[PDB]
Design a protein around this ligand. Structure first.
Ligand SMILES: Nc1ncnc2c1ncn2[C@@H]1O[C@H](COP(=O)(O)OP(=O)(O)OP(=O)(O)O)[C@@H](O)[C@H]1O
Ligand SMILES: Nc1ncnc2c1ncn2[C@@H]1O[C@H](COP(=O)(O)OP(=O)(O)OP(=O)(O)O)[C@@H](O)[C@H]1O
Ligand SMILES: Nc1ncnc2c1ncn2[C@@H]1O[C@H](COP(=O)(O)OP(=O)(O)O)[C@@H](O)[C@H]1O
Ligand SMILES: [Mg+2]
Ligand SMILES: [Mg+2]
Ligand SMILES: [Mg+2]
Lengths: 173, 458, 513, 52, 52, 460, 85
């Protein structure tokens, strides 16, 4: 998958967007550059053997919204190295960099029920204490949770569920 | 549900929705023109791509064909319903008779029996062949391997073993043809039907014409049938036509599976792929499998990784030599390389053990003298060295024997020799009881009485 | 019998009482591919190299490649049930095995789960599978014997307690027989035994364990198994589990003898793992660090000084030196020692025993080649009687073989050369020995005294074997107090030489072969 | 000895049918952390006898 | 033979432990899911957010 | 502050990403906490932007992606000078003998350039070893380099122990011992040998054992060279003993594949000659001070064709080749006279007496090596009587080159012997002429002087 | 899929002004140092066998002219060279 080759471009784009105070515009621009990449006919063209600059100018032709001489030049750079299919992964790493820079974390909470919303106030305060970031909750109700709740933040998980506790005790053979 | 996305030789990549990706060794199915093709899943790549091997000809496959996900591995009929019938790798009937009256189907991928279940046995099993049960005797429920290059008599020796054992033995038998000549399968089928012994034998044939996936999986099909008969509590005979073709079919696909080459270009998984197959051929406290396997030796190189790996898995090993075969001594067994777990004074008893080690010592000394003889000639030897040579040559001739399946080749009637006659004869030769007979008296005679009768007419 | 099962049912009830309800926190990833026992995992930012990674079920993987954006790991068990998108939790744990005295007489797999079916283990806790060897200042010189019971090895190639001795040769030359006889002979020496089986077929292991059970050896032995069916990650780790079990005894003032069987198959399994992880192949397609693999395995076998034992035991054991002795086995393809794995293992060890096919077919069994076989520790490993007698044997025998080659067409033979050639043939005949028939120190010393003082010289060659048998029987019935003296002391003096001279004179006059 | 232990085996199964209910309730109460006087013991006994 | 029978004894015992434990937790899953209560669920949350 | 982060761990090789303006220099040391234990990394390569590829001076086990790495702006520096005497140190110059802190006054980088062309010296003063075959066939000189070549189990270690006993005790000066890739048992035994003989006060020991990761072995030899160079630059005359040069090259081979280099020859790294030369060109005697060095060289499978021994042959001055063909006969020291040689063996140093004796011995053994092939098939009766006499006297000379050694007392159960150069020359002259035509072959085997071979003949 | 001189600050430079050809062809910067070989970004007018001058009055020979960089071999001690020179 494109993650490893997408990282350098994501960093460069975020750094440039920080200098010119345009991060939000850059995000909305990369969204469009990634979305044109997903189109059928454009995807067939990307898999073809066009010389870099001809492909770059056709892509820039479709990507009209892009800020000329900044985003369109980013397309030219990626077209020199044929990374245009990595654009969905050049995006979302830009979003990751933004969330890190803005010291903000999406954190997820899965339970057997819709949580009491007072519970969510306590959970959000607790997460803003566990991690020194503002925490956006987007909790979920899940049938698999017999009872209790799972808290997931980044790649750390704190299992408070009855299902997990059962399959943790059932392990004690 | 699935879509074909690549076709490279025998390997087909299929994409599935990420919530539905098939398990490893699941069977998939795709319509190829006017026929149905099964694919077996080998690897899960990322993003719902899955990499599979075609159980059939992959020519004519397009990209973008819709693929059906069968929820189970390859499963084959087992039990008495298979007896007397010829079946394919997929467990399909290949003889022109009707459908197989199966009652049960077993997945061909299985685990070996646990260490607790294994059973020991020391019951010596007799054969009609002098050299085999003299030099490398083997027991009921053990494994025998015939090692040899191209055209040195692996199949003929295995057919003699079939004739003798699998007809004095009373239980069921399974014959697995793996990547060998179709002509030989048809010949075997008929001479089984003419003898009316076919109704005791299940035959699975994966011969060389088949594309690589069939040759890869057919051995597991045969083992699955043999395991059904073993777990029923019977005593079973399993014959494998050439085990080497299984490893070779692994080699052919390994590069297309994206695995770095090893050693002499073999797949890196060679030892594991051979071991998981071989460990399932085992006698158990519930029932016993006796196994005879042919093992082709590429370029006669016994140090090649495939024969070298095979050697550790067998109880008795008989090594056939092209250099002996070109003398016309048949069976072309090398007694200085053939060996058995059963050549042990406790099981065989002292007379047999002493006779075998005496023969081995004399033949080794003859090897030591041949380099002197090549340059100087024999006249320079000492008078005891000349006696060593004179006896070693007679021993080499007396290991020859006419076979019934070799009646068509030689034109002379086949011979069956009891073990006692072998021990008595070789002990007499080494003691010099027959120092007055010519060498020709010993060539292709069944027993020592026949050597003296041949000597009277030279 | 089964009323005690009601009692252990109460034990199950009290599991609930002991259990802990606290919610832990852990780091998480997802499996992104599965192939041939290797898995790629996305995530696991806090995974460490060599860490145990826990999978669905009760299955584990070892993290080996910590690349950017992915972890590559090998599954320690049947992998085919794993699937893409399965969640996976990183523990904090390194791999550990049960260890202790209770293991003796048990057959366990490389993870230490018993497979003999004799119920659960009794053990003294767990020890890390991967561990560093004692340093220079913590060791003591090897100066005690471990008896093989073979005339050839104990005379020519002595093994000391703490030595690493390579057994090397082609297939079906007696490599395993020598090692299990070395185990069998420890039944009463006080040395604990460990037999590690890498890549063997399970019925062969059952047969070897049966032979250990027919003799008295099984009660003193741990058997560690990784059969040819088991994964290449369960292989390649088995030697280290066996080494941990040996180290438990080594670090408490006790002696352990560990037999790694087919170190070469450990190398082959490691090559499989390395190629499936796409690591660059080196010479003969092995990875470059295979030498580091075997060297760090074999440098654990050591004799430690008493101070290290006291520090480890925290003063519970004082004044006792512990030792671990390793006997690795290597298979050569055609006597070709130039292969990569044999060259590495020959570089590492303290010597080697060459077994070869020409001697074995000639009937010289054990088929020990006196010339290319060597023991670096030297007479320092022997008892004084064996040291004194055996010093001459091996070099005299090697020069005998050279002299025979030079003689093969000389007709006139000078008396010095004739003496050497006759003596060399009779010594070559003397060192042959039957399997599972180990000889005590006194027996070997007596037979060597017969050889080195020329009592054999007149005896005709085929009768030398019956001479040896009759001499042992005679001395066992008539002169047992001296046998006890020699076996206990291993001493040698002018009165010992005089008593042996009297015994040889008396036997050779009075008795018949 | 095999016949002897088989007889004792069926006896022990009869005894353990009761004890496994104590496992059910103790495990439920420990897992649910607090205690709970649940009513529908019909489910307890249904499992208790049915699979044993 | 006698030591063999005393090994077989332990082999018999362990299997019964395994059976009773697995089937007991199988019953406990039914019992606990049927005995879920909203106050107890809230108390699980109130426990874990108090230690988190 | 720590300014870099681990981004890969594959085997012994760790990649670290620094800020693009503070990238560590090549061969700089780096520091990281591997849990409780501090770990050092040595920078091999700068690649990409800000990323550096490094070798771990310790076990990689327990390293994580993300750990903070401190940048130490110097290469690995080791203690040097008199403080090192009597101490055992690891590759990093840390005490491993439990005796406490080294207490140094100065520390030197292990990486440094070789002496310049103007600084070298040619003072080939002859040095006596007390060993027959070495002093005759391959005479040493002070300040030269000596290599003991051989495959496994041929006598390199006990030969080096005999040389240590003879010269190093008599040297009256400091000595450095570099245990490159050595067996731990043998390092312990050597340490106690030096302590019990009470000479340890004049020697400093640097040990990288077999069990250690490739970086430790790769750099322990440079640590030893740095200590020897410190004593040389003071103006002292020092002895440098290297346990095995081959294992340095082998550690290089281990790391080379992971460092992304494509392979060459028989698996060896492409840089083999460069690495060998860069190590070997520092071991030289300058106008300020002399380093005399004895190096053991492993020869894989005794194949002197193999690139590592074939390459090291060019750097030495005296080369002694130990052959398993001779060792199989048990006739130690097992030195091959037809393969061993020295720069000092020419009349302008050795004198015509010694030169003529050595060339005579070489010619006799060469002729006998030809005659032996005839004998093996046609029989000695088929030879000329002149050739029969040559075969006899050559087969005697072959055994007279054997010498019982002090250090091998345990192996031979017999006392070792020392011989002067003058007596050695006289003995070989005596065998080349008729004086001892009448003694048997076995009368020479492991005897000592010619003056006691007659005694063994009387005993034989 | 792998990187070929795709490093963050060079990419940012091109994003700001793609036509970096405006800078002189005469000069470049080291972007890698290993085993006596250096990779140089720039030197659009480099030619096969040309001498490239390094700091310290040192030279390297341009041996690979690649589509994005020049591979050159250092004619002397190299261990002190650093990327960005
Ligand atoms: N016992 C025998 N007596 C006479 N001829 C024999 C005997 N065994 C083998 N041969 C000869 O060798 C030929 C080849 O035999 P066979 O087919 O058994 O060889 P194979 O080693 O199994 O060969 P392949 O590898 O080609 O399958 C026979 O057709 C026959 O000519
Ligand atoms: N001292 C001995 N005297 C006689 N026979 C022996 C002796 N030692 C071993 N053998 C026999 O040699 C054969 C091979 O022995 P063993 O299994 O020990 O060899 P190996 O080299 O370990 O074999 P493999 O490569 O199959 O593991 C057996 O039949 C065994 O009985
Ligand atoms: N001069 C000697 N006298 C007696 N034995 C020797 C002599 N030289 C070598 N040996 C024998 O060779 C063995 C190994 O030699 P060693 O130098 O330790 O091997 P390596 O050259 O591999 O380091 C010694 O243990 C001893 O048995
Ligand atoms: Mg055939
Ligand atoms: Mg074996
Ligand atoms: Mg040495």
């Amino acid at each position: 998958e494109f993650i490893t080759v997408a990282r350098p471009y994501a960093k460069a784009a975020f750094d440039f967007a920080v200098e010119h105070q345009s991060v939000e515009r850059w995000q909305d621009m990369l969204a469009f550059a990634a979305e044109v990449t997903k189109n059928e006919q454009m995807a067939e063209l990307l898999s073809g053997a066009l010389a870099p600059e001809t492909l770059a100018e056709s892509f820039i032709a479709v990507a009209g919204e892009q800020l000329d001489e900044n985003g369109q030049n980013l397309i030219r750079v990626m077209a020199e190295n044929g990374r245009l299919n990595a654009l969905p992964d050049v995006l979302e790493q830009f979003i990751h960099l933004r969330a890190v820079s803005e010291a903000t974390a999406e954190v997820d909470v899965i339970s057997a029920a819709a949580l009491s919303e007072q519970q969510l106030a306590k959970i959000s305060a607790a997460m803003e204490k566990r991690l020194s970031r503002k925490v956006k909750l987007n909790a979920k109700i899940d049938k698999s949770v017999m009872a209790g709740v799972i808290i997931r933040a980044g790649d750390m998980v704190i299992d408070g569920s009855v299902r997990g506790r059962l399959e943790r005790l059932a392990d004690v053979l | 549900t699935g879509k074909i996305v690549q076709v490279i030789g025998a390997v087909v990549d299929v994409e599935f929705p990420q919530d539905a990706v098939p398990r490893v060794y699941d069977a998939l199915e795709v319509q190829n023109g006017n026929e149905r093709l099964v694919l077996e899943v080998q690897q899960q790549l990322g993003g719902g791509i899955v990499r599979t091997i075609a159980m059939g000809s992959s020519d004519g496959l397009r990209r973008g064909l819709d693929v059906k996900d069968l929820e189970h591995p390859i499963e084959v009929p087992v039990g008495k319903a298979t007896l007397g019938r010829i079946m394919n790798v997929l467990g399909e009937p290949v003889d022109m008779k009707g459908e197989i009256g199966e009652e049960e189907r077993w997945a061909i991928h299985r685990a070996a029996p646990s260490y607790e279940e294994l059973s020991n046995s020391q019951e010596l099993l007799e054969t009609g062949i002098k050299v085999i049960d003299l030099m490398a005797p083997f027991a009921k429920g053990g494994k025998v391997g015939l090692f040899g290059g191209a055209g040195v008599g692996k199949t003929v020796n295995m057919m003699e073993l079939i004739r003798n054992i699998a007809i004095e033995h009373s239980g069921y038998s399974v014959f697995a043809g793996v990547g060998e000549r179709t002509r030989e399968g048809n010949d075997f089928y008929h001479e089984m039907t003419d003898s009316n012994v076919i109704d005791k034998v299940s035959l699975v044939y994966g011969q060389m014409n088949e594309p690589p996936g069939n040759r890869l999986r057919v051995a597991l099909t045969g083992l699955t049938m043999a395991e059904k008969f073993r777990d029923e509590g019977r005593d079973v005979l399993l014959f494998v036509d050439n085990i080497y073709r299984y490893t070779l079919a692994g080699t052919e696909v390994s590069a297309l599976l994206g695995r770095m080459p090893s050693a002499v270009g073999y797949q890196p998984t060679l030892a594991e792929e051979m071991g998981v197959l071989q460990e399932r051929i085992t006698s158990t406290k519930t029932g016993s499998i006796t196994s005879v396997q042919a093992v082709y030796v590429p370029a006669d190189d016994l140090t090649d990784p495939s024969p070298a790996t095979t050697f550790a898995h067998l109880d008795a090993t008989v090594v056939l030599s092209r250099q002996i075969a070109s003398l016309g001594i048949y069976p072309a067994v090398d007694p200085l390389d053939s060996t058995s777990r059963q050549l042990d004074p406790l099981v065989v008893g002292q007379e047999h053990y002493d006779t075998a080690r005496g023969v081995q010592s004399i033949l080794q000394r003859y090897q030591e003298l041949k380099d002197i003889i090549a340059i100087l000639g024999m006249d320079e030897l000492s008078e005891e060295d000349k006696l060593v040579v004179a006896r070693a040559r007679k021993i080499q001739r007396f290991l020859s024997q006419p076979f019934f399946v070799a009646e068509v080749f030689t034109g002379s009637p086949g011979k069956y020799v009891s073990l006692k006659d072998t021990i008595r004869g070789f002990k007499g030769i080494m003691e010099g009881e027959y120092d007055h007979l010519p060498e020709q008296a010993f060539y292709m005679v069944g027993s020592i009485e026949e050597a003296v009768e041949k000597a009277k007419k030279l | 019998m089964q009323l005690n099962s009601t009692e252990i049912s109460e034990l199950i009830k009290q599991r609930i009482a002991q259990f802990n309800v606290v919610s832990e926190a852990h780091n998480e990833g997802t499996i992104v591919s599965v192939s041939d026992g290797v898995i790629r995992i996305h995530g696991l930012a806090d995974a460490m190299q060599g860490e145990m990674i826990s999978l669905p079920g009760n299955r584990y993987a070892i993290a080996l490649n910590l690349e950017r954006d992915s972890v590559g790991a090998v599954v320690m068990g049947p992998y085919a049930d794993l699937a893409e998108g399965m969640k996976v939790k990183a523990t904090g744990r390194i791999l550990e095995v049960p260890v202790g005295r209770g293991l003796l007489g048990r057959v366990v797999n490389t993870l230490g789960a018993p497979i003999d079916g004799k119920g659960p283990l009794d053990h003294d806790g767990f020890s890390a599978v991967e561990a560093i060897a004692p340093g220079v200042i913590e060791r003591q010189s090897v100066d005690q014997p471990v008896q093989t019971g073979y005339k050839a090895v104990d005379s020519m190639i002595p093994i000391g307690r703490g030595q690493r001795e390579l057994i090397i040769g082609d297939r079906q030359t007696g490599k395993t027989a020598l090692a299990i006889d070395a185990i069998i002979n420890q039944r009463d020496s006080g040395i604990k035994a460990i037999y590690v089986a890498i890549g063997q077929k399970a019925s062969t292991i059952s047969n070897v364990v049966r032979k250990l059970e027919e003799h008295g050896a099984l009660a003193n032995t741990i058997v560690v198994v990784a059969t040819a069916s088991e994964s290449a990650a369960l292989q390649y780790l088995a030697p280290y589990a066996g080494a941990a079990m040996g180290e438990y005894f080594r670090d408490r003032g006790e002696d352990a003898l560990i037999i790694y069987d087919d170190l070469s198959k450990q190398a082959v399994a490691y090559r499989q793992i390395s190629l499936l992880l796409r690591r660059p192949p080196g010479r003969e397609a092995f990875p470059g660090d295979v030498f580091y693999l075997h060297s760090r395995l074999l440098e654990r076998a050591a004799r430690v000084n008493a101070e290290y034992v006291e520090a480890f035991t925290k003063g519970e054991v004082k004044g006792k030196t512990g030792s671990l002795t390793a006997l690795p086995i290597i298979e050569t393809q055609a006597g070709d020692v130039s292969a990569f794995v044999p060259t590495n293992v020959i570089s590492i060890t303290d010597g080697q025993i060459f077994l070869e096919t020409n001697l074995f077919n000639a009937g010289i069994r054990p088929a020990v080649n006196p010339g290319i076989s060597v023991s670096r520790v030297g007479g320092a490993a022997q008892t004084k009687i064996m040291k004194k007698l055996s010093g001459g044997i091996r070099t005299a025998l090697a020069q005998y073989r050279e002299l025979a080659a030079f003689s093969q067409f000389a007709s006139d033979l000078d008396d010095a050369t004739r003496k050497q050639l006759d003596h060399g043939q009779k010594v070559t005949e003397l060192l042959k020995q039957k399997q599972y028939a180990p000889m005590s120190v006194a027996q070997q010393s007596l037979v060597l005294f017969a050889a080195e003082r020329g009592y054999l010289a007149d005896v005709e060659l085929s009768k030398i074997g019956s001479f040896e048998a009759a001499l042992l029987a005679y001395v066992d019935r008539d002169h047992a107090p001296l046998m006890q003296e020699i076996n206990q002391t291993g001493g040698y003096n002018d009165e010992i030489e005089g008593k042996l001279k009297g015994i040889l004179d008396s036997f050779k006059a009075t008795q018949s072969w | 000895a095999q016949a002897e232990i088989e007889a004792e085996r069926k006896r022990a199964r009869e005894e353990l049918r009761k004890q496994v209910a104590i496992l059910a309730v103790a495990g439920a109460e420990k897992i649910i952390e607090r205690s709970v006087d649940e009513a529908a013991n019909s489910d307890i006994v249904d499992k208790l006898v049915a699979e044993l």
